[PDB]
From TrEMBL:
Domain NTF2-like N-terminal transpeptidase: 4-116
Keywords: Membrane, Transmembrane, Transmembrane helix
Name the UniProt record assigns to this protein: Penicillin-binding protein 5
Claim: Zinc is one of the keywords in the record: no
Origin superkingdom: Bacteria
GO cellular component terms, semicolon-separated: plasma membrane
Example GO BP: response to antibiotic
Penicillin-binding protein transpeptidase domain: residues covered: 314-608
Domain Penicillin-binding protein dimerisation per the UniProt entry, residue ranges: 123-279
Localisation per UniProt entry: Cell membrane
Gene it is expressed from: pbp5
GO MF term list: penicillin binding; peptidoglycan L,D-transpeptidase activity
Family of this protein: Belongs to the transpeptidase family.
Length: 622
């Protein structure tokens, strides 16, 4: 009756740590009612349930009925979450009076009687590190600065209020937040009461150094690594093995490898008699430390790649294309993962969600039209099937071309005016009209046959969430304009930067495609004969001219004095434009880079921003 709600209100209050509210629901202390006074009951739950971090108390099969006119009986099954994980199949039983709960020790844990105690031993498992190809930390334990207060040094009355106000407005907190922290239940006068992580102290405010998850590259590798947060009951819902007070990965590799990284915390939750002699083991685990995970990433390359994007929207992928190691996976703009993982205000989180440039997106894992860099793939395909002859010269006048008036107002646009265009000229000058006309001359069937040799439709063996690359939306183009547009990397093509680096690896591998790899020990995987050796010996020398020719679209990189083959490109979206650079060392095939600027501002380019990373990759990856 009203007793089913009393039992429910009681468990609910336990489930929110309101032990005081639980105690107030109990009968008075008498032989046939409660075993302890309301004050001793409060202290019992605070000591036991507080220490074991009990949360997620959920009950079922609540059965209640009359025994006496004044007393009902109740019974139910319960699960809870603790520091050593979930306890389930707990059968609870007792009686109510009038309505109040006749409190007894077995309403803490079911087999508890009289003066039984609870003993908890815990041994912290260490979360594994994510480290780069040389052992530098990407996700690790750091020494963190913790703001807190000693309530006995805050002063008295009005001076306490002034110190709490100074603390709240000198460390961006609320005075209300401070007072809850001080109030709680476990607090004592000279206890250090933690308040916040921070990276002039009013009286009573101190800083202690504490271990915590730490990301040394900060925003520079934030999308890839991700961050950890506090475990909630929904997480334990999904996974019972989860400790109630642990950390769980919330995005990136921290979330993709959470089970590997977290290990298992260890200890023993048990009921003893008043002397400490074990009566029942509730939970027993051996501690297991998490596994460290070693990436192909080069931290210095990662930081250079991110910084060179200058907070603008874009991405950079660097690889060693013969083995497929990913040396950098940069996405910009970014978020601060150390703030995501520590105190994160709703003021700043929504600011990250408001941003129209969306710093949360992993742009290296996001499909884009690859842009006119892709002419070099269309070229390879047409050199192979014979449709493209590198000695043929097309006559192209002006900046705009259209097959006929069925294209309406749509026209393919190129950048400059040289009117006798062969393949090499098309690649050096980035002539989209050449490419569009070849592609139409190939025909969809030959073009798709060549495209099918790459990795469209494939899911990559990578611990990064992403969609397979697509040629178009449907199985056919069903449009001459879409076929032409795809020829120079527009249309409905969608290829993310890692997929693009995979496809472009064929120029460093004599026509074999090498699959990207992020885990350092994983085996190199590849795919033979994606482009013919014919095509490759025509195209790489031209791509050298993209740099070496005075009018080559990447001629500014010639001044670096390092061996380079490159292709620039743009993708236009009906007046937003993306800018691309593809570059690798064609002397030693030591490295490869693909770089994008999304929605580029005027006079900006991926190429204008590549030099420092190319100098670093050239020096270190031969």
């Amino acid at each position: 009756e009203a007793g089913e709600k009393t039992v429910e209100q009681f468990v609910q209050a336990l489930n929110k740590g309101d032990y005081n509210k639980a105690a107030e629901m109990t009968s008075k202390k008498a032989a046939n009612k409660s075993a302890l006074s309301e004050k001793e009951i409060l202290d019992k739950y605070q000591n036991i349930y507080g220490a074991a971090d009990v949360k997620g108390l959920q009950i079922s099969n609540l059965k209640v009925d009359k025994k006496d006119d004044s007393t009902y009986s109740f019974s139910y099954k319960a699960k809870m979450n603790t520091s050593l994980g979930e306890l389930k199949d707990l059968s609870y039983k007792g009686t109510l009076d009038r309505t109040t709960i006749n409190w007894q020790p077995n309403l803490v844990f079911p087999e508890m009687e009289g003066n039984d105690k609870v003993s908890l031993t815990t041994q912290e498992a260490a979360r594994g590190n994510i480290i780069d190809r040389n052992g530098e930390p990407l996700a690790t334990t750091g020494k963190l600065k913790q703001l807190g207060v000693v309530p006995s040094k805050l002063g008295d009355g009005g001076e306490k209020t002034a110190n709490i106000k100074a603390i709240a407005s000198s460390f961006d907190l609320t005075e209300d937040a401070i007072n809850q922290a001080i109030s709680q239940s476990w607090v004592q006068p000279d206890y250090f009461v933690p308040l916040k992580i921070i990276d002039e102290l009013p009286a009573g405010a101190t800083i202690q150094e504490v271990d915590g998850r730490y990301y040394p590259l900060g925003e520079a590798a934030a999308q890839l690594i991700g961050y950890v947060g506090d475990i909630t009951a929904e997480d334990i819902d999904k996974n019972p093995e989860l400790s109630s007070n642990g950390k769980i990965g919330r995005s990136g590799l921290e979330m993709a490898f959470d089970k590997d990284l977290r290990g298992t915390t260890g200890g023993k939750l048990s009921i003893t008699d008043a002397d400490g002699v074990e009566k029942k083991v509730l939970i027993e685990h051996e501690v297991q430390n998490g596994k460290d995970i070693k990436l192909t990433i080069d931290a210095k390359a990662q930081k250079t790649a991110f910084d060179s994007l200058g907070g603008k929207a874009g991405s950079t992928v660097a690889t060693t294309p013969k083995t497929g190691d990913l040396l950098a996976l940069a996405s910009s703009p970014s978020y601060d993962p150390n703030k995501m993982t520590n105190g994160i205000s709703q003021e700043d989180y929504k600011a990250y969600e408001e941003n129209p440039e969306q710093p949360f997106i992993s742009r290296f894992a996001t499909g884009y039209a690859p842009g006119s860099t892709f002419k070099m793939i269309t070229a390879a395909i047409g050199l192979d099937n014979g449709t493209i002859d590198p000695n043929e010269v097309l006559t192209i006048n002006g900046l705009k071309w259209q097959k006929d008036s069925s294209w309406g107002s749509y026209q393919v646009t190129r950048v400059s005016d040289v009117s006798q265009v062969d393949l090499k000229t098309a690649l050096i000058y980035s002539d989209n009209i050449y490419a569009a006309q070849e592609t139409l001359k190939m025909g969809e069937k030959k073009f798709r046959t060549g495209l099918d040799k790459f990795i469209f439709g494939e899911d990559l063996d990578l611990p990064i969430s992403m969609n397979p690359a697509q040629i178009s939306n449907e199985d056919s183009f069903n449009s001459d304009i879409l076929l032409a547009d795809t020829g120079y990397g527009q249309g409905e093509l969608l290829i993310n930067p890692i997929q693009q680096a995979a496809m472009y690896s064929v120029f460093a591998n004599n026509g074999t495609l090498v699959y990207p790899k992020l885990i350092a020990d994983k085996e190199t995987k590849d795919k033979k004969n994606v482009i013919g050796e014919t095509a490759l010996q025509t195209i790489v020398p031209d791509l050298r001219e993209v740099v070496q020719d005075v009018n080559g679209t990447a001629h500014s990189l010639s001044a670096l004095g390092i061996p380079l083959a490159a292709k620039t490109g743009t993708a236009e979206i009906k007046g937003k434009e993306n800018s691309f650079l593809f570059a690798f060392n064609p002397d030693n095939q030591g490295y490869m880079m693909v770089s994008m600027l999304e929605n580029k501002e005027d006079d900006d380019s991926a190429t204008k921003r590549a030099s420092e990373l190319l100098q670093y990759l050239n020096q270190n990856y031969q």
